[PDB]
Amino acid sequence: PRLWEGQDVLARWTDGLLYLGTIKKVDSAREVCLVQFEDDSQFLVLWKDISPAALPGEELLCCVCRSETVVPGNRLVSCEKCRHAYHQDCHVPRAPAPSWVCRQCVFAIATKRGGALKKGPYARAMLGMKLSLPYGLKGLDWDAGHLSNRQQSYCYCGGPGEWNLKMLQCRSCLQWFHEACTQCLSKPLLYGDRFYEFECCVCRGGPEKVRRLQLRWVDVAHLVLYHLSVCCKKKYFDFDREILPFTSENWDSLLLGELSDTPKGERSSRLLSALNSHKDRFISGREIKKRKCLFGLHARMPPPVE
Ligand SMILES: [Zn+2]
Ligand SMILES: [Zn+2]
Ligand SMILES: [Zn+2]
Ligand SMILES: [Zn+2]
Numbered sequence: 471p472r473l474w475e476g477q478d479v480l481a482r483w484t485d486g487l488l489y490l491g492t493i494k495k496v497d498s499a500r501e502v503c504l505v506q507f508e509d510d511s512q513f514l515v516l517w518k519d520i521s522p523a524a525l526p527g528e529e530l531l532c533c534v535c536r537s538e539t540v541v542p543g544n545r546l547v548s549c550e551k552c553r554h555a556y557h558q559d560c561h562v563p564r565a566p567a568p569s570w571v572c573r574q575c576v577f578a579i580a581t582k583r584g585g586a587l588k589k590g591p592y593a594r595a596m597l598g599m600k601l602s603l604p605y606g607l608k609g610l611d612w613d614a615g616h617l618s619n620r621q622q623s624y625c626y627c628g629g630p631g632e633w634n635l636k637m638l639q640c641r642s643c644l645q646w647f648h649e650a651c652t653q654c655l656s657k658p659l660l661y662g663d664r665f666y667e668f669e670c671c672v673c674r675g676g677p678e679k680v681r682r683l684q685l686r687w688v689d690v691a692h693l694v695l696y697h698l699s700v701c702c703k704k705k706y707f708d709f710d711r712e713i714l715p716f717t718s719e720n721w722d723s724l725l726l727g728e729l730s731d732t733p734k735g736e737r738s739s740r741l742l743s744a745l746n747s748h749k750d751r752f753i754s755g756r757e758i759k760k761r762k763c764l765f766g767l768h769a770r771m772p773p774p775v776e
Contacts, residue, residue, distance in 0.1 A: 471496070473503060473522065480521040480578075481505050482629040483513075485636060486648030488578050491515070516622060519629055521574065524553040534560040551575040563602045573599050577627055577651070585655045597653065600626040600671040607645060616644050625651050626671065634662045634772050635700070638680070642673040654678035657723045660697040662772030665689065682725045683775075687744040690717065690726060692751055692773035695765065705766040706755055709745065713765065714738055 473479070477493045494512065495504035501517040524533070530546050531538045533554040540546060540557075547565045548555045549572040556572060558565045565572075571579075580587045580596040587593035605628045610619040617633045624631040625647045631637055636649040636659045647670055649659045654668075654677065667681040685693070694717055698707055707713050717724065718737065732740060745752050745765045755764025 471498065473517070473520065477522065479505070479523070481507075481515045482519040482521075482627065484630045484632055485583070486577075486625055486627050486629050486631070486650045487581055487583070488521070488574075493520075516630065518623075521552075528555075530555050532557045532560050549575055562604045563599065571595070573604060574627075581627075581648075581650045583650055584658045585649060586651060586653050588653050593653065597671065597677065600651075601675065603672055604628040607643060617646075624648070627651055636661065638666055638668040639664070640668055640670040640673055642669055645670065652678060652680075654680040657725055660693055660724070661700045662696045663693055664772065664775050665693070682727060684727045685724075685729065687729070687740045688748055688751070689773055690724070690729065691741055691744040691748075692767070694724075695745075695752070695767055696770065696772050699767060699770050705770070706760070706764045707766065708761070709742060709763040709765060713745075714741060717741060 473493055473496050475493055475496060479491055479493060480488045481491045483489055489507050491505040491507045493503045494506050497503065502514045503517065503520060504512055505515045505520070506512045530548070532546060534556060537557075544557050544559045545567060546555045546557055547561075547568060547570050550569050551571055552575050554572060556565055558567065561572065576592065576595050576599050577586075580592045586596060603626065605621070605623045610621050610623060612619045616639075622630045624637070624645065627648065629648070631646055631648060633639065633646045637646040638649070638652065638659070639646050647668070649655065665683040665685055667679075667683060669679045671678055691713075694713060695707065698712065698716060699705065714737075718734075721730075742763075746754070751767065753766050753768050755761045755766075
């Protein structure tokens with residue numbers, strides 16, 4: 471076929487990044503593969519997110535439309551890095567007529583955790599690529615909350631993703647974008663943090679615009695508790711040894727705006743009060759015969775905005 475067992479490929483993960491992997495099982499019906507990575511973890515990966523190595527004997531055929539047919543207006547261009555060939559019109563945006571580097575390779579170089587490269591040749595090149603989407607946005611089918619689509623197409627990259635796991639939603643097109651694919655963030659994203667106003671490159675026709683929304687103490691409590699729940703894979707967290715230290719030691723990264731006006735000696739009481747006041751959000755360890763100062767979420771769900 472196109473993919474076989476034991477084949478080494480590049481798989482795009484839900485963080486928008488590429489990882490080396492080996493195909494273990496091929497499902498031609500659902501078009502997914504069981505892929506094993508370097509840390510011996512195994513996950514299902516859609517075929518659209520699997521990049522096979524270019525063949526030395528697959529000379530000048532479009533890796534997208536598979537045709538060798540060439541026409542004046544639409545020539546074939548070979549990527550300098552991955553050696554895959556594209557028709558000029560089978561690449562988004564249009565590949566220039568002939569040191570060209572294709573969209574995925576541009577992303578593979580520029581994308582970094584905490585945000586992609588912000589300045590440099592590859593940073594400017596990715597911005598150019600990010601002016602367009604490699605998929606039809608209006609063709610996507612969303613759930614009720616506009617959190618996920620059945621195509622599993624997100625972001626500038628077109629890769630998979632979970633909205634709550636380091637992604638930002640554009641206020642204009644309502645699409646979700648990977649942290650690693652953005653170039654506008656100064657601090658790392660927390661899990662489930664929607665307290666942003668974000669607008670993508672496509673909607674602006676240029677650089678992204680991002681703004682931090684003002685959090686309340688109940689938001690801080692909920693966000694930290696949710697973020698730690700996901701990170702640490704557990705429900706209950708000690709206030710004095712886990713919750714408060716995370717908040718205080720990482721205070722600047724949390725971008726809490728006006729809350730920085732609160733005297734540092736008071737921060738503990740404000741946060742703890744929020745945890746004890748909203749019994750509809752937070753459950754105390756007392757409810758299961760443990761420490762009163764143990765707290766958790768009733769439902770491990772992100773902090774609601776407003
Ligand atoms: Zn992405
Ligand atoms: Zn083509
Ligand atoms: Zn390439
Ligand atoms: Zn947008």
